[PDB]
Symmetry: D3
Subunit: 133 residues, 6 copies
């Protein structure tokens, strides 16, 4: 049994895909245990969330995108939730994400890619602490 | 207008949260605030339904409303109150119309998936209950 | 209550069996009995529709009903008879409402996808026809 | 009967083209002609809506109708005109019924996703406008 | 042209996913040629169905699960139906089943995994003989 | 940014899957820039479209199928549209096409396979020139 942190990104709001994305996770039988709506996430939380990427060329653009509209932060719980939701999410690169995955079916950009999900136990604990202190 | 919607515990039990939210999303209403409650305080539920305090079902309904999670949402849109009420459908499963949320999904007078404010005055009161900030 | 539903041969031809069953399932009705007929005996069809024996369409309708498979289902739920009738929608394609099974999917008075018992008395008779056990 | 349907520019903006066409397709109407317009000529739009020429919204509506692509479709079926009108739903978002295209998807009196001919006489006129061949 | 044996498992009934599962197979153009509904399958048929696993640690628990609610047994027919429906079904292990498959999208447990499908021509004949003697 | 040529094949019309197929591409955020409806495509355009296969045993049967009902020719535009839509389409062979893809979910034959999509930049230019001279 694990908890993982998911962000529904501003592009999901713009494209009216919030329920579609949440629905794919819900139909897999994962349970919401925490959830917050952000009309606009604080820049500092975004920069902390993506701190690994702070020295990458796309960092500033990614952070700008992430504060360009609302986000939902959700903690999902289930057996092996972290890897399972990562599999559902699909590859970052739209040339690689498989049909059937959230990104494979719905995303068409490496940056505007609809959903974040924790990639490991350690990062899940870290990310949950950021969004749900 | 702004209206107050509750996703009720039966929606969680039946894994219909995204389905309900999706019907409102597809109608182009915007989420302005949202909170997740693992279990709403009974006092909050009693206040929300204070006008039913003398009804025979009052306690049973309060028990149901604290039996599982709730999501409270403020939606915004032109004439959002009446429009979301029409999408919601009648309380009575003998009357709620196919095509409405309750008409398609609810099969009980009490366990009826969704609350929506019924007037501007009740919207103000309910938003103040669920989002006192 | 228990009611008798037929999935008609046009549902098989048009690959709408799951769609129709899904609309009833999502309303939370429980299957109590079910039988698949590769081709129903004409005599069974004539008995089912015996009250239409003098109508001009009687033979054509019987021909249609044996033209492909049927699934007969007994569904159970509070006020299941009237509720499933409302989901079914009117026989006449000029009247069946969008949101109903026939309103959304049927475009003919005869080839109309689904039968549902219209009263408690007819439910008893029809269940005895299709499930004499 | 044959009727003239327009998929309006808001359907393109909101990525609802397939959703709308799918609702008509599932009702078993057959496409007899179809044209895609990257931008319809304003004169065509003015002719289509000539009966509204004195209305206060006439110019705003024409502006909207040339603001993005349109698909014009001739559909054929028994009583196709009235049936597709019923699927379409009322112009007014305070009236369009859940289960209809506008009832489920449209939230504005002007930006209302779909046109459908309202009579046999108007169907002839509109088909001659969009498909003069 | 082949026939294969599918079981819709009790978890599909509990989670109201029966039509969803049948619909995925129906949309692939497979035809139902036999079908039976079991309110509760006999223990002996279940133990025979899973006889290969009789000495495995999970055998008793699996059999208990399989008689814990209704099942539907279906014979589907199509060209290479056996391998095709196996592909649609997805891996037993929820750490392996691919998004897009029935289990990949809907199942979250190695035991409660929604659907059985024959794994070969020989086992299909055997399983059909069990459920449809 | 690329343009690719898609054909919706006559089997999609027969099976009422036109909107389903177009919807999968639309939800991926690809934009229609040209579209034509053919009640019956001219034999010569079909033979030119498939000229690579002119000496294969299935050529005549494939061409016969392709003129057996309507087709829609669509030009879609998006970043890397050619490879992305090919991925969505899925393998020609129904023993290989992955669940989650259009063919993996919906097609059950190597010939009647619902959709064509250009396989390269060069063939896209060629095919667009054929259908949209
Ligand atoms: N423009 C651009 N943006 C990128 C690139 N790589 C990553 N990003 C953005 C989008 C990602 O969602 C986010 C975090 O990257 P990640 O942890 O490698 O990917 P992911 O766990 O979201 O699939 O940063 C990239 O290569 N280019
Ligand atoms: N068991 C039972 N519960 C009832 C009955 N009438 C109302 N309720 C419950 C369910 C309703 O969602 C809630 C509030 O009643 P309402 O304001 O008349 O209905 P609504 O605005 O949720 O459609 O109280 C009732 O008659 N019986
Ligand atoms: N062709 C034709 N068929 C008809 C007509 N009226 C009824 N039928 C057929 C289709 C109906 O499903 C069946 C039983 O008629 P019903 O009990 O009045 O309708 P329903 O309970 O299936 O809605 O007989 C009719 O007027 N014309
Ligand atoms: N802004 C605005 N637009 C309107 C109003 N009434 C009609 N329109 C626009 C939207 C309609 O689709 C179009 C044609 O009006 P109509 O023939 O009465 O409606 P309809 O046949 O599209 O349902 O003109 C109106 O009252 N206000
Ligand atoms: N708890 C548990 N149950 C298992 C395990 N392996 C198989 N089972 C159960 C669930 C399977 O649906 C059933 C038959 O196993 P199978 O033939 O290897 O899998 P499958 O053809 O259903 O994908 O037995 C297992 O490793 N653990
Ligand atoms: N009957 C039959 N038809 C075939 C076979 N290979 C190809 N075809 C038909 C169906 C294909 O859609 C069409 C073009 O073949 P293709 O370019 O290799 O496949 P595709 O780009 O449509 O996946 O010709 C084949 O091996 N057998
Ligand atoms: Mg990451
Ligand atoms: Mg109320
Ligand atoms: Mg009747
Ligand atoms: Mg009009
Ligand atoms: Mg097996
Ligand atoms: Mg090719």
């Amino acid at each position: 049994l694990q908890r993982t942190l998911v962000l529904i990104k501003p592009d999901a709001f713009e494209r009216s895909l919030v329920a579609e994305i949440m629905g794919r996770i819900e139909k897999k039988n994962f349970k919401i245990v925490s959830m917050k709506f952000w009309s606009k996430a604080p820049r500092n939380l975004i920069e902390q969330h993506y701190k690994e990427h702070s020295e990458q060329s796309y960092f500033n653009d990614n952070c700008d995108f992430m504060v360009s509209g609302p986000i939902i932060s959700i903690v999902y719980e289930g057996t092996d939730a972290i890897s399972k939701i990562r599999r559902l999410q699909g590859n970052t690169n739209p040339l690689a994400s498989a049909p059937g995955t959230i990104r494979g079916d719905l995303a068409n950009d490496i940056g505007e890619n609809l959903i974040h999900a924790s990639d490991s136990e350690d990062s899940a604990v870290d990310e949950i602490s950021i969004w749900f202190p």
